[PDB]
């Protein structure tokens, strides 16, 4: 009775969204950018190799000074690197070695990480004692922590395998907003440049746009054939890209509520673990299970270059805020800085 | 050479961090990492009780060999997105309850979970230590309910020795890479205090086989 009426209404509303999206797709991105020229071949060299992790590296995150980065490996370590000199600034022992994500707070004051312990730990990098200590243990998720990103010294957004995301008040250690709506594990987060919005990808092949303060899902973006492992915003905040197990990256527009472009090749059959944009948004970089990172022309879906040199799966990409360098991390326990 | 006074001190700090990281690496490289799997309500707690919210770790030593057992229970999330984290563990310890043969059938769920991990692409070179728990309850139950409840093809007596051996074999038959990994099977009960000895000898065998491969003798 009521259940059949409600489910029938949901399907009619799905039809209305699809028809509204078909109505907006008056042209493809490839038709608009057809004659914008070709970036050509982007050939990047390894400028730094950062040696020191011994286990698989699962995450890294650049600081806002474009010089420091944090990397997380299942040695039980976070290492804060001086990417210009390769010097290790801090080595932080973890209480749980099964770390899957880390984040470098925009201020440089805090670094976060966590993983299979379901806890996002906040470390204080700038203490009077001189060592790095845990300031908070953000417990409350019921599944592994897949991605965390800072908003401020007192705000962090997490996503976990319990299919939710949460906004945490770090000082009190509480969840102030819980973001529900995914049906599978949430794998990746990316914050909007203005950190009023964020997007997440999950193991239901959809990405969702979340309103940080309202707690609602504003948009759901479908199109992938398999789980989404990585997500990143386009630099102007009006678009984002995903990478999934189906070996395709996809660019989604927030305002047209529509998929713009797919990035794929017949010779790429393995999954994608990490995506990032260059400073102009013109290049879309993705790390693959085949140990390479591909550089896509974000406007043409051409392969602009290949960053080859890792001996195992690429686990994480990160581009500096000034665009000077690309960092890649891999299961071979090395980081590489490219330019 | 061209470094400032502070740059040299920063490099010295980095080198000391490298020293500490290598010492922790050498210590970790000598520890046995055991991944503990099993079906719900299986005798995992009986094993941990003898060996001693996400991952629950149990640390113990036996004959000067250190172990870390990683219980992934209550991590109720898609295995495909974290089970790869345990690639490289020395061995997997898997718990199956014999008393579930008469209870999808719980015994078939155990075989399906066993096959799912046993032939997983992440663990092709990782051996399994398979504990058949509650052998005493099983000995009593099998005398009243035949094993053909979960193995209709079973041909044999409704007694402990024949039915327990059949169940062991049925799990060993799930190994699709017999030339790459061994399965070490042990029958246990809540009062069996040799469980740690079973792990120690099985892990020692694994370490010797791994080093034979690594030394090139393969």
């Amino acid at each position, epitope marked *: 009775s009521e259940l059949d009426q409600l489910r029938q209404e949901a399907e009619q509303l799905k039809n209305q969204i699809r028809d509204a999206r078909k109505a907006c797709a008056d042209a493809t991105l490839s038709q608009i950018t057809n004659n914008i020229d070709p970036v050509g071949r982007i050939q990047m060299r390894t400028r730094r190799t950062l040696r020191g992790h011994l286990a698989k590296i699962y995450a890294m995150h650049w600081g806002t000074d474009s*010089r*420091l980065l944090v990397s997380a490996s299942q040695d039980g370590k976070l290492i804060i690197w*001086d990417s210009y*000199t390769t*010097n290790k*600034v*801090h080595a932080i022992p973890l209480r749980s070695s099964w770390v899957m994500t880390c984040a470098y707070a925009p201020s*440089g004051n805090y670094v976060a990480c966590g993983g299979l312990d379901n806890i996002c730990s906040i470390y204080n990098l*700038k203490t*009077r*004692e*001189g*060592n790095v200590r845990v300031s908070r243990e953000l417990a409350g998720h019921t599944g592994y922590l897949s991605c965390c990103r800072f908003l401020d010294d007192n705000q962090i957004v997490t996503s976990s395998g319990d299919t939710t995301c949460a906004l945490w008040d770090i000082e009190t250690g509480q969840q102030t907003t819980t973001f529900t709506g995914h049906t599978g594990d949430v794998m990746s987060l990316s914050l909007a440049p203005d950190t009023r919005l964020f997007v997440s990808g999950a193991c239901d092949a959809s990405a969702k746009l979340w309103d940080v303060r309202e707690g609602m899902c504003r948009q759901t973006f479908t199109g992938h054939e398999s789980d989404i492992n990585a997500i990143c915003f386009f630099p102007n905040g009006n678009a984002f890209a995903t990478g999934s197990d189906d070996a395709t990256c996809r660019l989604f527009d927030l305002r047209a509520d529509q998929e713009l472009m797919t990035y794929s090749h017949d010779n790429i059959i393995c999954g994608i673990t990490s995506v990032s944009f260059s400073k102009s948004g013109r290049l879309l970089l993705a790390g693959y299970d085949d140990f390479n990172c591909n550089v896509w022309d974000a406007l043409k879906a051409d392969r602009a270059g290949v960053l080859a040199g890792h001996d195992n799966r690429v686990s994480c990409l990160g581009v500096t805020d000034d665009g000077m360098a690309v960092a890649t991390g891999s299961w071979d326990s090395f980081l590489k800085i490219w330019n | 050479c*061209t470094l*400032s*006074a*502070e*740059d*040299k*001190a*920063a490099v*010295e*700090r980095s080198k*000391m961090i490298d020293r500490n990281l290598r010492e922790d690496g050498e210590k970790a490289a000598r520890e046995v990492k055991l991944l503990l799997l099993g079906a719900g309500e299986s005798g995992k707690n009986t094993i941990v009780k003898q060996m001693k919210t996400g991952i629950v770790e149990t640390h113990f030593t036996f004959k000067d060999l250190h172990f870390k057992m990683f219980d992934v229970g209550a991590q109720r999330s898609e295995r495909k997105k974290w089970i790869h984290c345990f690639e490289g563990v020395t061995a997997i310890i898997f718990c199956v309850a014999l008393s579930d043969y008469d209870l999808m059938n719980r015994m078939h769920a155990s075989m399906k979970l066993f096959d799912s991990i046993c032939n997983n692409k992440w663990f092709t070179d990782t051996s399994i230590i398979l504990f058949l728990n509650k052998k005493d309850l099983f000995e009593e139950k099998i005398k009243k309910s035949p094993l053909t409840i979960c193995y209709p093809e079973y041909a044999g007596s409704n007694t402990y020795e024949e039915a327990a051996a059949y169940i062991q074999c049925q799990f060993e038959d799930l190994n699709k890479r017999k030339d790459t990994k061994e399965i070490y099977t042990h029958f246990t009960c809540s009062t069996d205090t040799k469980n740690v000895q079973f792990v120690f000898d099985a892990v020692t065998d694994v370490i010797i086989k791994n080093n034979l491969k690594d030394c090139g003798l393969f």
Partner: single-chain antibody
Amino acid sequence: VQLVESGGGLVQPGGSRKLSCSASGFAFSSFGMHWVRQAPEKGLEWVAYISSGSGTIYYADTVKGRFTISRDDPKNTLFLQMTSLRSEDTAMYYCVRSIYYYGSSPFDFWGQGTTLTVSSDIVMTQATSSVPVTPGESVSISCRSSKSLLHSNGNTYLYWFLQRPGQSPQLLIYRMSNLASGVPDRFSGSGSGTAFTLTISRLEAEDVGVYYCMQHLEYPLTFGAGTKLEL
């Protein structure tokens, strides 16, 4: 965070004495330690450095072969073993912590000091020894270096310290422009690499004391004579 020096007192010329510095409240083993001494009517003189892990040790040319600096991390204690003491060694000796990494603030905490009584350097010039000041007004204190302190890495290695009438020196600014943690925002610094200014936008009575410049580009570390504010 405390550093408590002990072992001072009167020594006869040519004798020996060991000073101790008991560290508490911070990760002593992770810091490098310096000894800086101040003669009864003079400014700061750098004495010796021992790095974290005791890998690197430096001495000032004035104490080479006579002073030995050593570290005991298990007891969180720094030692200075002095032999053949001279009358010129009369000074209060301050135990100073210093941690080095990208973005660190070395020389940020000084101990209280213990009084010892005996019966191609970079020269830091502070031409003005005293400035009369009024609370509520700004004041500028200048320093010049005999050598450029701007390194090719982009950092300019000058430090500002304030020593109040009854206190050990406090770090104000590190690397020319970076304000030390806990120091009021009224302090700022800038410079060319050879000429530097400390700006105090509004002077308070709590800011009265002697301001020192230090260079940290090369060892030995050197201090300026120090500019006193008379309030």
